Amino acid sequence: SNAVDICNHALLVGYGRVGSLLGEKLLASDIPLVVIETSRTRVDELRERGVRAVLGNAANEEIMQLAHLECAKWLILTIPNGYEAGEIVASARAKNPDIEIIARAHYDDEVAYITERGANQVVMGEREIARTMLELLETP
Amino acid sequence: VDICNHALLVGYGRVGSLLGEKLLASDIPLVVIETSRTRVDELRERGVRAVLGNAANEEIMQLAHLECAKWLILTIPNGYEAGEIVASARAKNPDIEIIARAHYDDEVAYITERGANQVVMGEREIARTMLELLE
Numbered sequence: 001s002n003a004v005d006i007c008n009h010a011l012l013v014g015y016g017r018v019g020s021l022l023g024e025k026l027l028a029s030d031i032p033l034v035v036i037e038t039s040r041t042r043v044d045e046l047r048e049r050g051v052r053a054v055l056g057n058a059a060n061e062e063i064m065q066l067a068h069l070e071c072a073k074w075l076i077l078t079i080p081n082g083y084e085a086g087e088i089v090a091s092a093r094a095k096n097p098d099i100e101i102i103a104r105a106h107y108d109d110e111v112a113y114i115t116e117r118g119a120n121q122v123v124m125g126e127r128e129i130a131r132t133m134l135e136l137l138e139t140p
Numbered sequence: 141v142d143i144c145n146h147a148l149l150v151g152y153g154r155v156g157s158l159l160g161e162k163l164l165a166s167d168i169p170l171v172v173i174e175t176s177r178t179r180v181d182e183l184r185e186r187g188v189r190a191v192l193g194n195a196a197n198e199e200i201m202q203l204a205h206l207e208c209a210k211w212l213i214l215t216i217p218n219g220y221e222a223g224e225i226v227a228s229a230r231a232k233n234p235d236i237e238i239i240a241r242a243h244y245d246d247e248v249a250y251i252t253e254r255g256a257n258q259v260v261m262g263e264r265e266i267a268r269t270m271l272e273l274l275e
């Protein structure tokens with residue numbers, strides 16, 4: 001079907017370095033999870049493991065419908081390009097003011113672009129690197 | 141070249157600049173190595189010690205007093221490049237605390253194997269932070 005029936009779920013875009021770590025934790029926490037991936041290999045792996053996964057690009061409206069964006073509680077973007085992410089965020093937000101949207105970025109101008117398009121939270125890798133390094137340096 | 145027991149920070153871009161500003165605010169003695177002439181000039185204009193060159197170059201490390209530094213902090217994105225720098229530094233300064241940036245699991249393992257005390261992988265920290273926002 002390439003389709004899901006579930007609602008009130010975390011809709012996770014990407015299952016690479018970032019998404020796989022979120023996925024594994026979300027699954028442990030019994031938060032209903034649907035993953036969208038462009039990678040056939042990753043979708044096949046996820047399905048083999050009993051995780052709901054929709055194959056396709058999250059920028060495609062039919063793919064979002066297949067993944068039940070309309071009734072998801074969270075939209076979590078873990079793709080690396082912040083402009084691409086911003087476009088997805090814009091489209092999701094237009095259709096639902098309430099959905100919690102979290103996205104990845106790597107540059108300040110991406111953060112701004114994504115935030116302007118309605119994300120609740122943007123997580124910038126390089127800021128988290130600096131913050132975590134400072135935490136290590138400040139530890140006795 | 142007048143300084144010891146300092147933080148020796150390699151890179152002053154998105155990561156290094158955020159870290160360096162906090163270190164300066166905390167009165168931690170600091171030396172920055174950068175390949176960017178522009179970044180070196182900006183730092184020196186503010187009275188921050190900075191050495192222009194590649195951190196893999198021995199003479200450059202020497203100008204930055206690696207041999208008597210307290211921490212070596214690598215904030216460059218290329219993990220395998222960082223691992224070689226880590227190895228060279230660890231040979232020259234057996235006691236130095238070494239922290240480095242990485243973006244892939246192969247780099248984390250490698251940089252550790254080459255002698256780093258700590259590795260921070262950006263993509264891992266993105267996932268950690270998102271989970272905190274979630275759970």
Ligand SMILES: Nc1ncnc2c1ncn2[C@@H]1O[C@H](COP(=O)(O)O)[C@@H](O)[C@H]1O
Binds near residue numbers: 013036039056057
């Ligand atoms: N527009 C998109 N729709 C669905 N998956 C994507 C899209 N863009 C990137 N990805 C996936 O996101 C993951 C990002 O991996 P990483 O950078 O390792 O966290 C990769 O596995 C890509 O296949």
Ligand SMILES: Nc1ncnc2c1ncn2[C@@H]1O[C@H](COP(=O)(O)O)[C@@H](O)[C@H]1O
Binds near residue numbers: 153156176217
């Ligand atoms: N081998 C190196 N030695 C000194 N500086 C470096 C080296 N490799 C990269 N850089 C600098 O590290 C910074 C990385 O920037 P960012 O990825 O924005 O944190 C840049 O400003 C580069 O000029």
Ligand SMILES: [Mg+2]
Binds near residue numbers: 244
């Ligand atoms: Mg690589």
